Design a protein around this nucleic acid. Structure first.
Lengths: 67, 82
DNA sequence: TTTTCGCGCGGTTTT
DNA sequence: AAAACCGCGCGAAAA
């Protein structure tokens, strides 16, 4: 079962959530819920690596811009 | 300096540059580089080594889910950014 | 047994 | 000071 609770799965969701919300803007608060609400901490796991690669960026607190 | 954000970039560079590789090759090289930093203290290597090791799993896993890399039974392979 | 890696307690940074 | 962030590393589930 420990696979249902993988960062990677959360990732896939975050991505879909991301690519759906047009503009290119995502509200870290929405995903939080929408993403199992497993616990906020995890969201940052995703954003830190997408930011390190340069595929995303902080646009404003609780908010980020694609690419 | 540190943090997931700084190690994901190290990871992503390593893999593309090696084309094909493994968890251990990736991790050992990041550990060795951090450790040979001019501003680093020897007493701190065992922690650090452990910490970089746990960090690498988090990076590989989202990078994986983004379809940017392979990772298929110990074999990690490059793909591409978007 | 070893390899992966979920989980969440505090400490830092921004507001 | 409050709200957002996000270092860390323990210990149990998968190889």
């Amino acid at each position: 079962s420990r696979h249902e609770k993988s960062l990677g799965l959360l990732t896939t969701k975050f991505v879909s959530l991301l690519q759906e919300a047009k503009d290119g803007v995502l509200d870290l608060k929405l995903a939080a819920d929408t993403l199992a609400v497993r616990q906020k901490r995890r969201i940052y796991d995703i954003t830190n690596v997408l930011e390190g690669i340069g595929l995303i960026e902080k646009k404003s607190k609780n908010s980020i811009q694609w690419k | 300096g540190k943090g997931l954000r700084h190690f994901s970039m190290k990871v992503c560079e390593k893999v593309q540059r090696k084309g094909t590789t493994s968890y251990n090759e990736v991790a050992d090289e990041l550990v060795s580089e951090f450790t040979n930093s001019n501003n680093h203290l020897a007493a701190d290597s065992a922690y650090d080594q452990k910490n970089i090791r746990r960090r690498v799993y988090d990076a590989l896993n989202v990078l994986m889910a983004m379809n940017i890399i392979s990772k298929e039974k110990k074999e990690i392979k490059w793909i591409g950014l978007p």
